[PDB]
Amino acid sequence: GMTEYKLVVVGACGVGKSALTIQLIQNHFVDEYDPTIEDSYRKQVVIDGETSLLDILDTAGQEEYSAMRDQYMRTGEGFLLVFAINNTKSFEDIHHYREQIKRVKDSEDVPMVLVGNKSDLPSRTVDTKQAQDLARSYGIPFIETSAKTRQGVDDAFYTLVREIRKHKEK
């Protein structure tokens, strides 16, 4: 059989949400993708031997209220919290995005994975250890990625699927 998963990618403008999504959907690095386009994308993959259909909302547009975004967030099963390892403000924004998720959710137990993207860049400003502290404080996994080299991309999405499976077993 197959399982479907409704996933959401959140984070500050410019962290690589679209690049990560496109690495998962199309298996290469798209370095110019309209920063304003918010859409959902479907890809069938195989995770731990089970056919898995991932529907992924790549958040974008503006900070102003979008009902369609809200309705997708309210029903999302798992969230990638993406920052860029060369952008301290994007890391400090993670708290805000997690609070926003918890607010549109009734459950206190929402599957999430913290994702530190752009791991290929030498100009690092956020230490892996600072991100591990924050993920531990939330009780979620931390995954390092590069949408440029594809390092960690399957790890981020498939770890979120494994967290959703654990949630569904409760």
Ligand X SMILES: *CCC(=O)N1CC[C@@H](C2=NC(=O)c3cc(-c4c(O)cccc4F)ncc3C2)C1
Ligand Y SMILES: Nc1nc2c(ncn2[C@@H]2O[C@H](COP(=O)(O)OP(=O)(O)O)[C@@H](O)[C@H]2O)c(=O)[nH]1
Site membership for ligand Y, residue 19 (CB under 6 A): yes
**What is the C-alpha to C-alpha distance for residues 73 and 68, in angstroms, rounded to an integer?**
9
117 binds, among ligand X, Mg ion, ligand Y, none (CB under 5 to 8 A by kind): ligand Y
Question: Could you say whether residue 56 binds ligand Y (CB under 6 A)?
Answer: no
The item of Mg ion, ligand X, ligand Y, none sharing an interface with residue 148, based on CB under 5 to 8 Å by kind, is: ligand Y
Q: Which residue is nearest to Mg ion (CB)?
A: 18
Question: With binding defined as CB under 6 A, does residue 101 bind ligand Y?
Answer: no
Identify the residue among 3, 25, 33, 101 touching ligand Y (CB under 6 A): 33
CB nearer ligand X, residue 59 or residue 87: 59
Query: What is the DSSP annotation of 47-108?
Result: ETTEEEEEEEEE--S-SS--HHHHHHHHH-SEEEEEEETT-HHHHHTHHHHHHHHHHH-S-S
The rounded distance, in Å, linking the Cα atoms of 105 and 107 is 6
Out of 8, 110, 113, 118, the residue judged to bind ligand Y by CB under 6 A: 118
Measured between alpha carbons, how far is 99 from 57 in angstroms, rounded to an integer? 18
Nearer to ligand X, 7 or 60 (CB): 60
**CA count, 13 A, side-chain hemisphere, 99:** 5
Residue 19's binding partner, choosing from ligand X, ligand Y, Mg ion, none, with beta-carbon cut-off 5 to 8 A by kind?
ligand Y
Q: b/e for 43-69, b at 16 or more Cβ within 10 A?
A: eeeebeeeebebbbbbbbeeeeeeeeb
Residue 146 contacts which entry, ligand X, Mg ion, ligand Y, none (Cβ below 5-8 A, type-dependent): ligand Y
Size of the chain in residues: 170
Site residues (CB under 6 A) for ligand X? 10-11, 13-14, 17, 35, 59-63, 69-70, 73, 97, 100-101, 104
